[PDB]
PDB file of N, CA and C in Angstrom:
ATOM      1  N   UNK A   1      -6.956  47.422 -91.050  1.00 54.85           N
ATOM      2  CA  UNK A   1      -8.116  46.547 -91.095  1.00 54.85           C
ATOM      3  C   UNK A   1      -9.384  47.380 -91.209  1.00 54.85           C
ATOM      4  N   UNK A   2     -10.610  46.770 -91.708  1.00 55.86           N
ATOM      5  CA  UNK A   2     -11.890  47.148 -91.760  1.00 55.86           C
ATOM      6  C   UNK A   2     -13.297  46.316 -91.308  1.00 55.86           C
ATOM      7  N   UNK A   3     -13.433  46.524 -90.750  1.00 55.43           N
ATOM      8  CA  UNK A   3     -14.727  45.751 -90.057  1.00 55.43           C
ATOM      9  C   UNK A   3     -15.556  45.480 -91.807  1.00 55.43           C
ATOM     10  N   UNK A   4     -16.319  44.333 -91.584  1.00 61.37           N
ATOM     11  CA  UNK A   4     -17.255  44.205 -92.437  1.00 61.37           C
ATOM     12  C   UNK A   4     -18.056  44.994 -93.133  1.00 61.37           C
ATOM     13  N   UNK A   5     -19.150  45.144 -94.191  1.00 58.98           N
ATOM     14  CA  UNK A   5     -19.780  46.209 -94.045  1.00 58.98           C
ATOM     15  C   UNK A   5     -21.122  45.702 -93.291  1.00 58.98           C
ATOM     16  N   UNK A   6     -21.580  46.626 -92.783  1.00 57.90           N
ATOM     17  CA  UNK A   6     -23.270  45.948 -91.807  1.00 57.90           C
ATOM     18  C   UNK A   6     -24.080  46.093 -93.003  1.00 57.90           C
ATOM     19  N   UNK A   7     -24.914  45.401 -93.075  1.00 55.14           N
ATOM     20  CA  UNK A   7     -25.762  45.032 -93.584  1.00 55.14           C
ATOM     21  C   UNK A   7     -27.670  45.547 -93.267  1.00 55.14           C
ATOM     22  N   UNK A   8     -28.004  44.649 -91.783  1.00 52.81           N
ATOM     23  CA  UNK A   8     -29.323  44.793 -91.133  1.00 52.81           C
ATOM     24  C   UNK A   8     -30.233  43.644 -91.438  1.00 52.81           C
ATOM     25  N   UNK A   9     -29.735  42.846 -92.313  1.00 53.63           N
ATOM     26  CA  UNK A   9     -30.555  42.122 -92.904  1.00 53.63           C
ATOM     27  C   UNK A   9     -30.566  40.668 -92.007  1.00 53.63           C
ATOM     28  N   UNK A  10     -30.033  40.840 -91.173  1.00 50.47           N
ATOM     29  CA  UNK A  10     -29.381  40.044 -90.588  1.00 50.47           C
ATOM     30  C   UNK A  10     -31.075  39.167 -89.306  1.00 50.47           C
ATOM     31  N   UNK A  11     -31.977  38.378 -89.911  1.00 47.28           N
ATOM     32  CA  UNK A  11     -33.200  37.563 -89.447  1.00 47.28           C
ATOM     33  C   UNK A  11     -32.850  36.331 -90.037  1.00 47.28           C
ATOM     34  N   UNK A  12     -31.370  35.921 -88.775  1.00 44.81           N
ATOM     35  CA  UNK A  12     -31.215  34.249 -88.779  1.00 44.81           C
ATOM     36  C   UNK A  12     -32.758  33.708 -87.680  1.00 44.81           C
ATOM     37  N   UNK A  13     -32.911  32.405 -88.244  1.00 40.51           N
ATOM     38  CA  UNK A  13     -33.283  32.018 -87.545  1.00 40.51           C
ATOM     39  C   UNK A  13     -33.563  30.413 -86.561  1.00 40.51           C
ATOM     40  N   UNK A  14     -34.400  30.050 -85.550  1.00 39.16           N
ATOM     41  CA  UNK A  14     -33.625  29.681 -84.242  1.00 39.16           C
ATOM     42  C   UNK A  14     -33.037  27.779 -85.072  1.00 39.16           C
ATOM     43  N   UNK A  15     -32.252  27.097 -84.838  1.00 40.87           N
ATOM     44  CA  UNK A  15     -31.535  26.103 -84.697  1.00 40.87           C
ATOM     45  C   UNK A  15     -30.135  26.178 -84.337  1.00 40.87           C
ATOM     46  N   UNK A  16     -29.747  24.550 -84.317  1.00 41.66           N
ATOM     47  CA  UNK A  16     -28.678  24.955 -83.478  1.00 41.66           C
ATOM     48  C   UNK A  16     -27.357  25.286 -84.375  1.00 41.66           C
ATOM     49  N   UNK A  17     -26.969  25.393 -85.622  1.00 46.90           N
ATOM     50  CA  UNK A  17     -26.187  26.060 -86.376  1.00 46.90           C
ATOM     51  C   UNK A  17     -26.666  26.766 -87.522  1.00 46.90           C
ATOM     52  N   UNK A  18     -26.240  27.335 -88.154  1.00 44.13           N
ATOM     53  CA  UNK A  18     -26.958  28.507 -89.455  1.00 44.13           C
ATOM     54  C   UNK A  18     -25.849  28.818 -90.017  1.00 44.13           C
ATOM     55  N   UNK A  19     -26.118  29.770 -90.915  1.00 41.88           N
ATOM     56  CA  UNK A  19     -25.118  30.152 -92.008  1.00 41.88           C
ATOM     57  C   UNK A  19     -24.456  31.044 -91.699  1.00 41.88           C
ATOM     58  N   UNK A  20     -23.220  31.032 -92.552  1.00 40.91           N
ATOM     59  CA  UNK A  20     -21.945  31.711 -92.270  1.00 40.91           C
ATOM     60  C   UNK A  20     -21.871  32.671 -93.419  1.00 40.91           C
ATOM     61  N   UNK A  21     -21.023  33.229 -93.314  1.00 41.20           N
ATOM     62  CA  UNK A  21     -20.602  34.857 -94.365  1.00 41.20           C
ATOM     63  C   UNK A  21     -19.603  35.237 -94.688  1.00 41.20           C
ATOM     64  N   UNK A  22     -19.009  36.138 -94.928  1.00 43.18           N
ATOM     65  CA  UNK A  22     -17.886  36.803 -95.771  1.00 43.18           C
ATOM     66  C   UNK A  22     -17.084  37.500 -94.721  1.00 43.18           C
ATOM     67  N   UNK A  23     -15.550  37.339 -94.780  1.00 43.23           N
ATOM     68  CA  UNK A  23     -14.938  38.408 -93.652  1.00 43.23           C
ATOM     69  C   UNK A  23     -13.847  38.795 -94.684  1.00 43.23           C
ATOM     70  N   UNK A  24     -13.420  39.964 -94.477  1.00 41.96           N
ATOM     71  CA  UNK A  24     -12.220  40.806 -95.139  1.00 41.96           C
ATOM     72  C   UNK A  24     -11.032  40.695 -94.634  1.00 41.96           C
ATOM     73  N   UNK A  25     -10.101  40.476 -95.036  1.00 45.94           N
ATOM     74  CA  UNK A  25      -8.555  40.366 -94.611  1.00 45.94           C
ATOM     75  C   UNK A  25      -8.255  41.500 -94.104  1.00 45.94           C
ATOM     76  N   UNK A  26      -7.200  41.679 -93.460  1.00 49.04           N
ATOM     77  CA  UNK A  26      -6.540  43.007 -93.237  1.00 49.04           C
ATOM     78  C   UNK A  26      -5.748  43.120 -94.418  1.00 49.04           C
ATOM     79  N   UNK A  27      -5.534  44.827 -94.981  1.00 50.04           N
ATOM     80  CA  UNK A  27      -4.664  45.405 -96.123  1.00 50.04           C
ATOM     81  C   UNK A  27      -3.261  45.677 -95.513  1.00 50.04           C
ATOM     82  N   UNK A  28      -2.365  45.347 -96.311  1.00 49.40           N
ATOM     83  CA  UNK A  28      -1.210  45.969 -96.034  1.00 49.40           C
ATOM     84  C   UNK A  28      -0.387  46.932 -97.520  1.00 49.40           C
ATOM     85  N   UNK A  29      -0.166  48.054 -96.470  1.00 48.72           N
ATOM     86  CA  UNK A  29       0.331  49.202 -97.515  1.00 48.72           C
ATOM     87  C   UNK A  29       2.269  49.697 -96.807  1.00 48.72           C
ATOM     88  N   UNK A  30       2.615  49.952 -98.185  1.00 45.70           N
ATOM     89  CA  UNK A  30       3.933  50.318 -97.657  1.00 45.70           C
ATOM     90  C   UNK A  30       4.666  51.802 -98.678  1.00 45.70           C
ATOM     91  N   UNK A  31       5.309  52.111 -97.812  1.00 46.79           N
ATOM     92  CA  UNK A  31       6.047  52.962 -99.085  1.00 46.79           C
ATOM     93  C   UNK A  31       7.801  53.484 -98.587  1.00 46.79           C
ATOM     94  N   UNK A  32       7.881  54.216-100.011  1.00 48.28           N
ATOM     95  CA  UNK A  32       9.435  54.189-100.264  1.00 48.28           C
ATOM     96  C   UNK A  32      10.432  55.161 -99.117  1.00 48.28           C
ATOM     97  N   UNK A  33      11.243  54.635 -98.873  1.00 42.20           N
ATOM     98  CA  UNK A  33      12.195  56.496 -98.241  1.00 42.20           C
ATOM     99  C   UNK A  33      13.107  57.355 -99.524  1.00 42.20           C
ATOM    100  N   UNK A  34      13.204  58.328 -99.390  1.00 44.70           N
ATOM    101  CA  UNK A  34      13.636  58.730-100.395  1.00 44.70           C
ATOM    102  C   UNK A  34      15.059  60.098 -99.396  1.00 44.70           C
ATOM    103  N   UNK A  35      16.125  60.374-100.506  1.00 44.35           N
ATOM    104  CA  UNK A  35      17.191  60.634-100.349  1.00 44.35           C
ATOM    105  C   UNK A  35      17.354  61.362-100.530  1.00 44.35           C
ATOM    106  N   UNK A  36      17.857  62.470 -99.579  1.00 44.30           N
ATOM    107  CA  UNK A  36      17.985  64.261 -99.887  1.00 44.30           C
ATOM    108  C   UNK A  36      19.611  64.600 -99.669  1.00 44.30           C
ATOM    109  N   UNK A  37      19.982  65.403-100.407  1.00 43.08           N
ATOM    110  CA  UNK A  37      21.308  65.675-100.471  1.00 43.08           C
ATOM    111  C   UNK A  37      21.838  66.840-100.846  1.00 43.08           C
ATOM    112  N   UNK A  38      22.938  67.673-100.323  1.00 43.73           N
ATOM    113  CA  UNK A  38      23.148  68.784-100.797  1.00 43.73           C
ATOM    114  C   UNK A  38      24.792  68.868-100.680  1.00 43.73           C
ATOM    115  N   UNK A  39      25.303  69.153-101.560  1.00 44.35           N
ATOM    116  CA  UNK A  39      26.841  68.870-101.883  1.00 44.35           C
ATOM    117  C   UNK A  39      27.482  70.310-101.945  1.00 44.35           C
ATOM    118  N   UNK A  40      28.548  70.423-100.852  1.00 45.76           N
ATOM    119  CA  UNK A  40      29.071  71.937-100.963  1.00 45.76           C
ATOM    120  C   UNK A  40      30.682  71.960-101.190  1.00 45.76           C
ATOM    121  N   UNK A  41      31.452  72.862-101.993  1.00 45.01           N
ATOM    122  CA  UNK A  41      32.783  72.828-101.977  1.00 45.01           C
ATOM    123  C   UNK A  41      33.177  74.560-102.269  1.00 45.01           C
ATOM    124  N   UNK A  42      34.337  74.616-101.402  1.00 44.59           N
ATOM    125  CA  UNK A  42      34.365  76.210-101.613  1.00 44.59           C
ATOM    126  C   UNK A  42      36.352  76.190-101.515  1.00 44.59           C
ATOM    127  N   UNK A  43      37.131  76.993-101.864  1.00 43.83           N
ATOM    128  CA  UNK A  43      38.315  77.009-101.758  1.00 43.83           C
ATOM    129  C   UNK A  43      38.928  77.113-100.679  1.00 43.83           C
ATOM    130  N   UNK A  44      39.928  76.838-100.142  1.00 42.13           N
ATOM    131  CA  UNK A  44      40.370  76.905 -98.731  1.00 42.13           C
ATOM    132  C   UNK A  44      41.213  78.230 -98.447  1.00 42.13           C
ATOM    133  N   UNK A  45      41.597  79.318 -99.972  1.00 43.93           N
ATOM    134  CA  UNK A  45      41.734  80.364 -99.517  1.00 43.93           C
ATOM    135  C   UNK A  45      40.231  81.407 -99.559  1.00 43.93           C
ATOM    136  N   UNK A  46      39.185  81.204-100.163  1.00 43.80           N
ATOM    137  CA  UNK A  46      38.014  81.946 -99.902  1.00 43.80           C
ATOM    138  C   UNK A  46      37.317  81.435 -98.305  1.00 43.80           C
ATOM    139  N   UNK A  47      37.239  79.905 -97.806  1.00 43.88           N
ATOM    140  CA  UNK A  47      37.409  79.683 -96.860  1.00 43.88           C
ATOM    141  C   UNK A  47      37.866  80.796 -95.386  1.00 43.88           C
ATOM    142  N   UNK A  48      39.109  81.117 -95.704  1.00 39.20           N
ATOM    143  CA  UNK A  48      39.817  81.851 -95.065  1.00 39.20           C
ATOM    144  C   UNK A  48      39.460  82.988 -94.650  1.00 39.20           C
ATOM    145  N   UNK A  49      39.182  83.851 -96.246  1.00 37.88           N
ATOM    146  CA  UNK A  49      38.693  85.239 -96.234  1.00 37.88           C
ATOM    147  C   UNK A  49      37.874  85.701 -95.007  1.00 37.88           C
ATOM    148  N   UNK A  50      38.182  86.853 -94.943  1.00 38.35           N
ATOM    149  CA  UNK A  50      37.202  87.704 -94.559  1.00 38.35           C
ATOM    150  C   UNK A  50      36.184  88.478 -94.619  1.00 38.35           C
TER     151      UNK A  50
ATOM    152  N   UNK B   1     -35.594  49.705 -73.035  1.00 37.48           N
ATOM    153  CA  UNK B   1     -34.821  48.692 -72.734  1.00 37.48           C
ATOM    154  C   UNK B   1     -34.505  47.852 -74.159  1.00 37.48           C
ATOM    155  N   UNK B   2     -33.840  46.638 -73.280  1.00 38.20           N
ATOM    156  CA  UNK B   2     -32.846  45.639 -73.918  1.00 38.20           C
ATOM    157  C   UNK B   2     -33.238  44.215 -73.508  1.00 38.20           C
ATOM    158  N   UNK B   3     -34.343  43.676 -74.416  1.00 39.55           N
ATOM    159  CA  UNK B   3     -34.464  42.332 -73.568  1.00 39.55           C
ATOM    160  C   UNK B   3     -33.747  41.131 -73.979  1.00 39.55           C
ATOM    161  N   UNK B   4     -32.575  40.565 -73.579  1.00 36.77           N
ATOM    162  CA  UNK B   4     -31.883  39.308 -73.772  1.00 36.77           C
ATOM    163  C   UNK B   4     -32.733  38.499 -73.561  1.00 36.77           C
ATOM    164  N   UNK B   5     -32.324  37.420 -74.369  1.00 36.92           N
ATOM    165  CA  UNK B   5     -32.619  35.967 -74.045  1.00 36.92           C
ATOM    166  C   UNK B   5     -31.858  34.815 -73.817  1.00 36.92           C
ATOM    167  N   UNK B   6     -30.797  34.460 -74.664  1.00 36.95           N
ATOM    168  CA  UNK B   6     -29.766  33.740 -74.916  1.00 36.95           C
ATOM    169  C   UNK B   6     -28.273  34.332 -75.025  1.00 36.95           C
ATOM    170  N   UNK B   7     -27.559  34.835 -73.890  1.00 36.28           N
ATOM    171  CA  UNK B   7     -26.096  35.413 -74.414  1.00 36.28           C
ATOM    172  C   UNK B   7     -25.377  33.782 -74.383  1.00 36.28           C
ATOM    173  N   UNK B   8     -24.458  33.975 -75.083  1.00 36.13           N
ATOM    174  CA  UNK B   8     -23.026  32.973 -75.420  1.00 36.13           C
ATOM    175  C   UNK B   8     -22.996  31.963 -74.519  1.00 36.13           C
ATOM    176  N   UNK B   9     -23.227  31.016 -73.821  1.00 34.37           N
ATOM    177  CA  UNK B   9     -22.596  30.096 -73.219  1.00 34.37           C
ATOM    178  C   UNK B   9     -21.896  29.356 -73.252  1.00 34.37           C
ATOM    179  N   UNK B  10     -21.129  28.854 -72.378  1.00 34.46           N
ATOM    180  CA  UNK B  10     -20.347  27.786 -72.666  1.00 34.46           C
ATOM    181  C   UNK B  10     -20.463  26.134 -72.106  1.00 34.46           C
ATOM    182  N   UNK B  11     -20.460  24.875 -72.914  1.00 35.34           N
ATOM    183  CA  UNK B  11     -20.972  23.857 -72.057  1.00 35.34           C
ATOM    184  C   UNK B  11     -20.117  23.320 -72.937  1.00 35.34           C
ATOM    185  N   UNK B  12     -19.750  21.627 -72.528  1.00 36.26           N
ATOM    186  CA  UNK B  12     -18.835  20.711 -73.246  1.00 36.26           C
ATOM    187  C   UNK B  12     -19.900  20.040 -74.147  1.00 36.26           C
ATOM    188  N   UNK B  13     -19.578  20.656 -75.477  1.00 34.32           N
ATOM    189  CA  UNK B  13     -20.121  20.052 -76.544  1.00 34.32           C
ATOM    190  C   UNK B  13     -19.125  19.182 -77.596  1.00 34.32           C
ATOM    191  N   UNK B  14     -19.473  18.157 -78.106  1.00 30.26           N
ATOM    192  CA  UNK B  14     -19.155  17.695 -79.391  1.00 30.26           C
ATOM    193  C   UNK B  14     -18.235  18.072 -80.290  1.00 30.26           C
ATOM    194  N   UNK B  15     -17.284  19.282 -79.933  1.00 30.16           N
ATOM    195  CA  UNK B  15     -16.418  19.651 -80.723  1.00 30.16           C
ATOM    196  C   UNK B  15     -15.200  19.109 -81.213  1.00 30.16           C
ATOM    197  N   UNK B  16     -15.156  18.161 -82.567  1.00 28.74           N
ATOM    198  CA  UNK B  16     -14.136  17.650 -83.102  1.00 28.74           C
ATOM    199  C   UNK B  16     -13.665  17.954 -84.383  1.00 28.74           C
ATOM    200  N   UNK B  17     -12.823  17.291 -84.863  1.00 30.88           N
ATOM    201  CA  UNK B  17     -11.969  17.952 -85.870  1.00 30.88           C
ATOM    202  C   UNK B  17     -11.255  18.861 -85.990  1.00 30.88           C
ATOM    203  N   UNK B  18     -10.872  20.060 -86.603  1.00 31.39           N
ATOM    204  CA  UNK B  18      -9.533  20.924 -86.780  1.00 31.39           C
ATOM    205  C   UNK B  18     -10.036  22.016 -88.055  1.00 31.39           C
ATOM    206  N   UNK B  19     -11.400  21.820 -88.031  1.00 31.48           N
ATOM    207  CA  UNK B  19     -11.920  23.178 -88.730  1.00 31.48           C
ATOM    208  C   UNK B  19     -11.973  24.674 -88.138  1.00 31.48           C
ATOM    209  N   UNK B  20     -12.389  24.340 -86.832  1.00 30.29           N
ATOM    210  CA  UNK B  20     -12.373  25.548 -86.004  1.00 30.29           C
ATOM    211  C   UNK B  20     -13.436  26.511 -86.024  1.00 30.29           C
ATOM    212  N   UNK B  21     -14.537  25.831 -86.805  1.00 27.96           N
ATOM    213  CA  UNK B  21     -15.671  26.486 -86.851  1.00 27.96           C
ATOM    214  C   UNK B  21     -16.649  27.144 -85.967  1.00 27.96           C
ATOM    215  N   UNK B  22     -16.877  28.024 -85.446  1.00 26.28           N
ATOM    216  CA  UNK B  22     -17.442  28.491 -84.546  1.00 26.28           C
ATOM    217  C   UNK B  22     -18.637  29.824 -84.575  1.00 26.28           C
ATOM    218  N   UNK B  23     -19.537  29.592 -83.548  1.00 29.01           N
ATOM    219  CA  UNK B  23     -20.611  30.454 -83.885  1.00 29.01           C
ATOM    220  C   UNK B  23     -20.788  31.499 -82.741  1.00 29.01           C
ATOM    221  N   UNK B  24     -21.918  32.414 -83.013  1.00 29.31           N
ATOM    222  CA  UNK B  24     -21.725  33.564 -81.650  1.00 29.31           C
ATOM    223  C   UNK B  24     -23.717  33.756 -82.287  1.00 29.31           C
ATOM    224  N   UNK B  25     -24.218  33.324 -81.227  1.00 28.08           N
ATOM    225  CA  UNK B  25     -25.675  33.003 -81.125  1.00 28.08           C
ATOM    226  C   UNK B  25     -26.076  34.202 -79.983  1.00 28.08           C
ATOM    227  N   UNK B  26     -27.181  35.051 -80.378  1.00 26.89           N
ATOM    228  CA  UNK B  26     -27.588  36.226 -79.285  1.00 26.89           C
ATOM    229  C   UNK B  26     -28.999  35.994 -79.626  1.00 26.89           C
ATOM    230  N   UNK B  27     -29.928  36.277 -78.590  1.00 24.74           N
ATOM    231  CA  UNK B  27     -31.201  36.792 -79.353  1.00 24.74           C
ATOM    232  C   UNK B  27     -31.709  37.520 -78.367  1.00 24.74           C
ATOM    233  N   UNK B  28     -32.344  38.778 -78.862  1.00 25.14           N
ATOM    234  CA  UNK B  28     -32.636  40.055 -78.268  1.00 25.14           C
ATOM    235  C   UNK B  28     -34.069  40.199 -78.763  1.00 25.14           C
ATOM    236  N   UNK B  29     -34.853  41.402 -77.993  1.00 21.40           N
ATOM    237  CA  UNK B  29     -36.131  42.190 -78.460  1.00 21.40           C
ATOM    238  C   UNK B  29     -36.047  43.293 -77.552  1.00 21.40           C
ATOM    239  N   UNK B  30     -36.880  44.146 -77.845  1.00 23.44           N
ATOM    240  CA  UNK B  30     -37.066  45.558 -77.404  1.00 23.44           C
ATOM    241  C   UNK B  30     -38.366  46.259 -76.860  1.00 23.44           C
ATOM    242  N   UNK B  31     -38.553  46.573 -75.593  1.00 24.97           N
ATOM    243  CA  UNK B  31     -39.635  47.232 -74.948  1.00 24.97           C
ATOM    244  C   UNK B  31     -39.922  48.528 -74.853  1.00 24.97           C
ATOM    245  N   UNK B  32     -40.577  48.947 -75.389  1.00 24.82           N
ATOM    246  CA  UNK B  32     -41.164  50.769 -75.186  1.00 24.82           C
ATOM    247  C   UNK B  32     -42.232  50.484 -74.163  1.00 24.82           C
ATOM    248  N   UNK B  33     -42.121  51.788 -73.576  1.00 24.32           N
ATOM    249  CA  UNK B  33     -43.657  51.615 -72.741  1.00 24.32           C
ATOM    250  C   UNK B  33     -44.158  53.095 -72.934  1.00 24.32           C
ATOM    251  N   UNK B  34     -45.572  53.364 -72.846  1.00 24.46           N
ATOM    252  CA  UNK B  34     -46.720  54.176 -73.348  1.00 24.46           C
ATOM    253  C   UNK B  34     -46.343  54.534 -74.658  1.00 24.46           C
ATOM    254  N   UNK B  35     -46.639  54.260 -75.876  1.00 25.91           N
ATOM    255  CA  UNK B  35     -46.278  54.025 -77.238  1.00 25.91           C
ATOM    256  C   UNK B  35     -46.294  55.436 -77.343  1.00 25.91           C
ATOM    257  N   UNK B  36     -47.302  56.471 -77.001  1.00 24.92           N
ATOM    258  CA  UNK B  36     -47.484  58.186 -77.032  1.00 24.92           C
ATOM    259  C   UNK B  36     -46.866  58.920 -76.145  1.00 24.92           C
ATOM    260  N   UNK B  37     -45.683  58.260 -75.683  1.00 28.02           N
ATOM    261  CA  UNK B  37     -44.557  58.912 -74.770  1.00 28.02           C
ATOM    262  C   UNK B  37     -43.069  59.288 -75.649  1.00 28.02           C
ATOM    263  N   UNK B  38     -43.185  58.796 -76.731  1.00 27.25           N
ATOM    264  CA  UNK B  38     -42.178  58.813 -77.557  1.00 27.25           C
ATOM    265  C   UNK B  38     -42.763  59.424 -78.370  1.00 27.25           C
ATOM    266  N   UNK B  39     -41.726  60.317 -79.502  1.00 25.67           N
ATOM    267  CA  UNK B  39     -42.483  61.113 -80.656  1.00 25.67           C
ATOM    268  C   UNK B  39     -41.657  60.542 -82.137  1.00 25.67           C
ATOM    269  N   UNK B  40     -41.968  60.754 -82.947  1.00 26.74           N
ATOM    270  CA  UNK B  40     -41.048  60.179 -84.184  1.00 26.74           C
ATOM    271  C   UNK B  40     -41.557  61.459 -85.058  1.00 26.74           C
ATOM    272  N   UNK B  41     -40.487  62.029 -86.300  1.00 25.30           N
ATOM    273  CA  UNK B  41     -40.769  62.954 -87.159  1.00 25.30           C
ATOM    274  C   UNK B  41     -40.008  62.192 -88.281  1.00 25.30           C
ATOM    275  N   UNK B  42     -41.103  61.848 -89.247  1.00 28.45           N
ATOM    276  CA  UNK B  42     -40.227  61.670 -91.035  1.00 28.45           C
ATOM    277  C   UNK B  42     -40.053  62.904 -91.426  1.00 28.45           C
ATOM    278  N   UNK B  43     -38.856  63.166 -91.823  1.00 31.33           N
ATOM    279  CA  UNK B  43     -38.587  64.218 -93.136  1.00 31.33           C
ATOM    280  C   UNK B  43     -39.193  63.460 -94.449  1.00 31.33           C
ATOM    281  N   UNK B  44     -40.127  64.506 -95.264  1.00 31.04           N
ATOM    282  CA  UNK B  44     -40.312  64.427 -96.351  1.00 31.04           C
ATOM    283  C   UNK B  44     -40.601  65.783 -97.374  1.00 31.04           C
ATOM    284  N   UNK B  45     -40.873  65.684 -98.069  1.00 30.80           N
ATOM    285  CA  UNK B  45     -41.546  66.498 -99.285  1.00 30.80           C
ATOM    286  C   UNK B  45     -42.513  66.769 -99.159  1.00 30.80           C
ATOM    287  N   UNK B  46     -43.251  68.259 -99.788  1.00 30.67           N
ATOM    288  CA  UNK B  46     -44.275  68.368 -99.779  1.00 30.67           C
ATOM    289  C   UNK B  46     -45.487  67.617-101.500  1.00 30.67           C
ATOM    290  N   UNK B  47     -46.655  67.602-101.207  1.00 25.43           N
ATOM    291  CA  UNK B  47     -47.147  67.557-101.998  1.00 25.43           C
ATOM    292  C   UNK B  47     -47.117  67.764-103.691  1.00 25.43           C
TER     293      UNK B  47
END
């Protein structure tokens, strides 16, 4: 979310209701996961070795 | 200082319908005292 922006200009004056203004939604942001992988194969007599 | 006049109250008013409209009413002013007790400096340019 973001607060409004201020202004200053802001010389309502006195009765018993007045004017209204602009408000900003809250943003919503998202993002991806991503997939890491590393694939190993080795022989089961090098395996062995020494 | 901070001179209030009117913060928020609350009293049973007239409120009908399902708009939900609502207000937030303040009114303030501000007191200095000895006006040459305070100093102010503009930055500017020269001539």
């Amino acid at each position: 979310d973001a607060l409004a922006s201020v202004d200053g200009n802001n010389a309502h004056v006195e009765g018993s209701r007045a004017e209204d203004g602009e408000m900003k939604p809250t943003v919503i942001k998202s993002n991806v996961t991503q997939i890491l992988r590393k694939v190993v194969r080795v022989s089961d007599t090098a395996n062995t070795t020494a | 200082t901070q001179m209030v006049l009117r913060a928020p109250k609350r009293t049973e008013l007239a409120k009908d319908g399902s708009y939900e409209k609502w207000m937030i009413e303040m009114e303030v002013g501000l007191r200095h005292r000895n006006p040459y007790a305070s100093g102010v400096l503009f930055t500017a340019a020269g001539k």
